[PDB]
Symmetry: D2
Subunit: 95 residues, 4 copies
């Protein structure tokens, strides 16, 4: 299959110029070896962006506390995303 | 195993039975996937308005791409893992 | 003055005229409040699914409170400003 | 007026124990001097939480690039929040 995605990621600012490129080229490499096709890349260099967000969500709210393995969450993950009855879902793990 | 907290929202539209089955259905998945459900809270139907305020500094990278889920999935995985990635987001049009 | 980028979503429900007025109405507010609109993009009606992935470390503080907006507003302001606050979120039920 | 709110904030982990309390007591102080009423506070101490979020939003999407003063954004801010036609709005500034 194939969908058009847009992706943003942030590299911590402590990383050294050469390392940077290595990681960067690395991730594009990661995308490519799997059939993905990169149409364009932008590098904004180091930035400090403040974001404020505001949303309103109405629905039947459910909260779960769970001990699980990585494998488990993806299953939950996967199935939540497809089901039209689930608007939004969120996961916090301790690290 | 890790501790996890999991939040999800159910369409305001859904009915009692459908709802009821759902919670059950999602409950099973976890557990049949070897997870223990420490605790559950049904907060019922809520309209919550929220405001997120955050500041993130670093090297910003943005890609437009054509990919399937696995390529994406994999990527996600490695970003999650990689130490020098603070954050990342992916969005597709349905 | 600062550079700002501003995103907003319009109910899928809204009609052409209502929509049209809206964009206009919000456009005016900024400008009558002395803002210059560098550029505008109408992406039309989109269904975008998104996934945010982030890790935040620090001292976590959580409060349940009864307050009006100004008390909140003020607080927000000072958190935004204070140097040792990485992030903060506020949620109310409508 | 008065509404019930819940608030979360994170203090950077570099801050020193005594400073901590000072800030903390400070912010409660901030809430109180303005009629707010704190019913409960929890301190989880220093934590590293990973969050993954997933939502789906359908609506007419609008993007603006703008040079504005603080004052301006709040006006935008305020009016967006109330209007039932605006589901979600977001603001990025450079800092
Ligand atoms: Ca879904
Ligand atoms: Ca990471
Ligand atoms: Ca701050
Ligand atoms: Ca609104």
């Amino acid at each position: 299959a194939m969908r058009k995605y847009e992706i943003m990621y942030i590299i911590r600012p402590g990383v050294e110029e050469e390392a940077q490129k290595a990681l960067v080229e690395r991730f594009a490499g990661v995308l490519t070896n799997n059939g993905a096709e990169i149409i364009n890349t932008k590098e904004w260099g180091k930035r400090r962006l403040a974001y404020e967000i505001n949303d309103l969500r109405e629905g039947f709210y459910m909260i779960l506390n769970v001990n699980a393995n990585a494998e488990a969450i993806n299953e939950f993950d996967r199935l939540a995303k497809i089901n039209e009855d689930i608007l939004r879902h969120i996961v916090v793990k301790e690290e």
